[PDB]
């Protein structure tokens, strides 16, 4: 049955995982670069604590950014329902996959089936884009979706990825904050596989148990503390099995990551996930001795401090030739902190900027919108600096040199603040470069159709002009004659003009005064 308002289907447990994956990938769904499965009890009891709401909103944002798939119970009860709402909001503000897995036998309303439409225990949620029902056996609605979900995740973990950069494998990360028994079973069966993933010491109580644990008596007493009524209700043998499962889970801790309750940063979620994957990439021993791939993975996810702590330090002796490949990627990835780290870790920027590198970068990374705007400005308004910049960019697009100035210009025209500052901190003519950047930004904003982009460019130009003024004040205070010599210093083909001419042509009254 297909319902739209998305795709729904009824499957049998005997169905092979490969066939399902081929079906999903062929026509409707794009290749996954990452997967998140949310482990939460299907009970209708759910608390929308502000912390949990924020955490799950950040998780959805991260999934949207990466393009990752999301697996969930999808029965419209408690947490799952909230998740649906969030994804709806996200699409109202690309596309995000929100696959849900449920049991056909545990569905109140059945509408067998161009596309049948049904509007209405555990009735499935309508916010999820795709939904899969599996009740080939146990028509009384016992738990059967968990086995199929585990099989599909196992198959995915075995699949190779061409451009994943995680060693050719998909990160599978089981995000779990559920207090249910099935949550514990799912966590155990996932950890039995090479699936690193996360728990939060928050509302989830069994998650709190696991976090606190990270002897049989101690685990038993912790469980009783966090599950007084639940532990009282359960029988002896099933609860002994519970303790066995929990001990087996706690056996391995490298795959197990936890979120501290004290932490209140906005980027905590990402960190956790990142760290999890990192450990599984390193402790897996498949590429533990590998050095490059670790750095590539830490560059993908915005984790700078961890990379400095782990990748670098004296023992490795990385050398210079290895850092060029990651610097080039960081330039495109827009990771200014990593750019600064690489520059201050021994990379020679001057040698890095080769003619072929700059040519390829300008050709296949200059925004088409920005290129059209620059062409229009050069053809219509024109200026002493616009002609020079246009000639340089056209030369690099078709096929001293001052490569640093070219890189600074490339960063500026794309409106990258931190990267532009990082590059500026390397140039020789800092004050002149800042004045030229301010003038160029002003001219571009004078011929920019975008409304808010004009304000952003104006703010950036103001920042750069203030920077130049402060630098020159310090320089002049240090010495009176050398500062004036710098003032009159004629540009060596920056724009053919010195600081005074650029300032007067840019109407920079503050600098002149």
């Amino acid at each position: 049955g297909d319902i739209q308002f998305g795709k729904y289907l009824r499957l049998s447990c005997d169905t092979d995982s490969e066939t399902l994956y081929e079906l999903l990938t062929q026509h409707w769904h794009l290749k996954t670069p990452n997967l998140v499965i949310s482990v939460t009890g299907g009970a209708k009891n759910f608390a929308l604590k502000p912390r949990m709401r924020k955490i799950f909103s950040r998780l959805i944002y991260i999934a949207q950014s990466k393009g990752a798939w999301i697996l969930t119970g999808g029965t419209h009860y408690g947490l799952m329902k909230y998740i649906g709402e969030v994804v709806r909001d996200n699409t109202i503000s690309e596309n995000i996959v929100a696959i849900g897995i449920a049991a056909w036998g545990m569905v109140s309303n059945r509408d067998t089936l161009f596309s049948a439409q049904y509007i209405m225990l555990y009735i499935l949620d309508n916010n999820h884009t795709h939904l899969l029902l599996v009740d080939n056996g146990c028509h009384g609605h016992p738990t059967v979706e968990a086995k199929l979900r585990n099989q599909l995740e196992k198959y995915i973990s075995e699949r190779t990825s061409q451009d994943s950069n995680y060693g050719g494998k998909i990160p599978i990360v089981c995000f779990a904050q559920g207090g249910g028994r099935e949550t514990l079973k799912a966590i155990n069966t996932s950890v039995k596989s090479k699936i690193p993933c996360v728990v939060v010491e928050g509302s989830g109580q069994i998650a709190d148990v696991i976090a606190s644990l990270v002897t049989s008596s101690m685990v038993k007493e912790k469980l009783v503390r966090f599950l007084p009524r639940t532990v009282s209700r359960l029988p002896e043998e099933e609860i002994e099995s519970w303790i066995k499962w929990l001990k087996e889970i706690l056996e391995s801790s490298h795959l197990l990551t936890v979120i501290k309750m004290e932490e209140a940063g906005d980027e905590i979620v990402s960190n956790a996930i990142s760290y999890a994957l990192y450990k599984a990439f390193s402790t897996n021993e498949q590429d533990k001795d590998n050095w490059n791939g670790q750095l590539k993975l830490l560059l993908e996810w915005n984790q700078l401090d961890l990379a400095s702590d782990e990748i670098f330090t004296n023992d490795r002796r990385w050398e210079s030739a290895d850092l060029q490949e990651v610097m080039f990627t960081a330039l495109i990835k827009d990771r200014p902190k990593f750019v600064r780290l690489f520059l201050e870790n021994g990379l020679n920027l001057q040698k890095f900027l080769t003619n072929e590198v700059l040519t390829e970068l300008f050709s296949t990374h200059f925004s088409t919108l920005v290129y059209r705007n620059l062409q229009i400005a050069k053809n219509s308004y024109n200026d002493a600096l616009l002609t020079f910049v246009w000639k340089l960019v056209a030369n690099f697009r078709r096929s001293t040199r001052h490569p640093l100035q070219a890189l600074f210009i490339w960063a500026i025209l794309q409106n990258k603040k931190e990267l532009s500052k990082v590059i500026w901190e390397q140039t020789k003519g800092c004050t002149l470069a800042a004045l030229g950047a301010s003038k160029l930004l002003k001219t571009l904003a004078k011929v920019k159709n975008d409304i808010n982009a004009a304000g952003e460019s104006e703010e950036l130009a103001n920042e750069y002009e203030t920077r130049a003024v402060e630098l020159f004040t310090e320089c002049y205070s240090n010495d009176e004659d050398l500062a004036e010599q710098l003032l009159v210093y004629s540009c060596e083909a920056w724009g053919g003009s010195n600081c005074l001419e650029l300032a007067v042509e840019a109407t920079d009254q503050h600098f002149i005064a």
Partner: peptide
């Protein structure tokens, strides 16, 4: 087409 493949796979 797609429905035919779906029902063939699901028997």
């Amino acid at each position: 087409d797609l429905v035919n493949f779906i029902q063939a796979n699901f028997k």
